Amino acid sequence: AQNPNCNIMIFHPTKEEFNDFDKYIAYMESQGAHRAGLAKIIPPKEWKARETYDNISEILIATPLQQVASGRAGVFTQYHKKKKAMTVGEYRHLANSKKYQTPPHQNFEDLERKYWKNRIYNSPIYGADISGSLFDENTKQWNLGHLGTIQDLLEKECGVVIEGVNTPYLYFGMWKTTFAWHTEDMDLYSINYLHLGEPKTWYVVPPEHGQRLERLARELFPGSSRGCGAFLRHKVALISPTVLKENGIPFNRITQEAGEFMVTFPYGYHAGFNHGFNCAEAINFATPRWIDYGKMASQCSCGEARVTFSMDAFVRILQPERYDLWKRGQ
Ligand code: NA
Ligand SMILES: [Zn+2]
């Protein structure tokens, strides 16, 4: 079996290999990439997402979110406090201000140390889940707005036509902006392109060991776990690498830089943080291999996990037994 230790693999496709998205995902899996839960793809030197990022300042972040932490440095939850709308230009200025700017640091490891030591004592602001794309329409390879839809995949595999659309989202981040431990909706794949700015550090648990993280999360967040048997779907829980190590949880870490893609694989738990001002674009996608994960995905029915109406059809068709209860939660 390929990649038995579940290491994060990094790929350098040629322009030729970059010409068929689906084929290259399958290729990566043939090499065992999915066992890690996360892979990095460095685009060929010939490729570009768009010409320049000189004209993005007028994008609106309708509802910036302040991420307020509760708990201890290595084991905390965060809630999202809504803030007044601002443009990307205004946001960039705020990110670079003395209050929010990245501290001096020696390297990525040093900054990681500072993050886990100090994150809870600050409340960074970020723009999340902004429908839109920064790929040029003329970018023909790995354009996240031009991928095949999950609805078409489900139709092709299962024969059923369903409503729903599948469009990309933008994220604007700053130092200490935090992504909580989660898998994707319906344990889908995701792909994330870092368009501009400072890095993102990722942590990931191999899919085969997802239940180990869930078990630890139940132990570390007992109140939340009592409230909901899939509370990680709420996307509020953080656990540091130190605590994961102490508890023997298998995981890996990697830093994504501007111009790099990251793919998360079905049931790959991941979390991370931004190093400073940046802009990323992400979208969920599916392959034939996803279907069996979709059928088995745990669901939040307690009301907390709010998702797009596009997920309705996936639960309805793949998980009919769970549908009524889940629907009540929405
Ligand atoms: Na994700
Ligand atoms: Zn819930």
Beta strands in the chain (DSSP E): 9-11, 38-41, 60-61, 65-72, 75-82, 86-87, 125-131, 169-173, 178-182, 189-197, 200-205, 237-239, 252-256, 261-264, 269-274, 278-285
CB contact at 8 A, 59 and 87: yes
DSSP state of 175: T
Calculate the CA 1 to chain-centre distance.
Answer: 27
* Distance separating alpha carbons of residues 32 and 76, to the nearest angstrom: 33
111 CA to middle of ligand 2, Å? 33
* Distance separating alpha carbons of residues 214 and 16, to the nearest angstrom: 40
CA distances from 282 to 132, 172, 189 (A): 10, 11, 11
User: Which residues are within 8 A (CB) of 174 and not within 5 positions of it... i.e. 6 or more apart?
Assistant: 91, 94, 95, 100, 124, 125, 126, 274, 276, 277, 278
CB contact at 8 A, 232 and 268: no
Ligand nearest to the CA of 224: 2
CB contact at 8 A, 282 and 66: no
CA distances from 302 to 131, 182, 227, 228, 321 (A): 26, 17, 7, 6, 16
What phi and psi, each to the nearest 5 degrees, are found at residue 34? -65, -20
Residue 222 one-letter amino acid: P
Estimate the crossing angle of helix 310-318 against helix 320-329, to 10 degrees.
Answer: 150
* Distance separating alpha carbons of residues 212 and 232, to the nearest angstrom: 13
CA dihedral sign, ordered 283, 232, 35, 164: negative
* Reported structure resolution in angstroms: 1.7
184 CA to middle of ligand 1, Å? 5
Q: Which residue has the tokens 């509370």?
A: 231
Give the β-pairing of 189-197 and 278-285: antiparallel
* Distance separating alpha carbons of residues 33 and 102, to the nearest angstrom: 32
- 115 φ/ψ sector (left φ>0, alpha ψ -120 to 50, else beta): alpha
**Nearest to 40, CA basis, from 264, 251, 282, 279:** 264
DSSP state of 18: G
* Distance separating alpha carbons of residues 95 and 89, to the nearest angstrom: 10
303 CA to middle of ligand 2, Å? 6
CB contact at 8 A, 112 and 175: no
68 CA to middle of ligand 2, Å? 19
User: Which residues are within 8 A (CB) of 36 and not within 5 positions of it... i.e. 6 or more apart?
Assistant: 3, 6, 7, 8, 9, 204, 206, 252, 265, 268
Question: What are the structural domains, with CATH classification, of the chain?
Answer: 1-330 (2.60.120.650)
User: Which residues are within 8 A (CB) of 259 and not within 5 positions of it... i.e. 6 or more apart?
Assistant: 42, 43, 49, 194
* Distance separating alpha carbons of residues 262 and 30, to the nearest angstrom: 17
Give the β-pairing of 86-87 and 60-61: antiparallel
Ligand nearest to the CA of 326: 2
* Distance separating alpha carbons of residues 91 and 95, to the nearest angstrom: 6
* Distance separating alpha carbons of residues 59 and 61, to the nearest angstrom: 7
169-173: strand order across its sheet:
9-11, 38-41, 261-264, 189-197, 278-285, 169-173, 125-131, 65-72, 75-82, 237-239
Tokens, residue 208: 């085969």
300 CA to middle of ligand 2, Å? 4
Q: Which residue has the tokens 């400072």?
A: 198
Ligand nearest to the CA of 38: 1
- 3-state secondary structure (DSSP) of residue 77: strand
Q: DSSP assignment of 183-243, as one string?
A: PPGGG-EEEEEEEEES-EEEEEE-GGGHHHHHHHHHHHSHHHHHH-TTGGGG--EEE-HHH
**Nearest to 211, CA basis, from 238, 179, 250, 239:** 250
Q: Which residue has the tokens 């109140």?
A: 223
CA atoms within 13 A on the CB side of 301: 13
CB contact at 8 A, 270 and 174: no
To the nearest 10°, report the CA torsion of 111, 272, 235, 184: 180
* Distance separating alpha carbons of residues 49 and 56, to the nearest angstrom: 14
Q: Is 260 annotated as a binding residue?
A: no
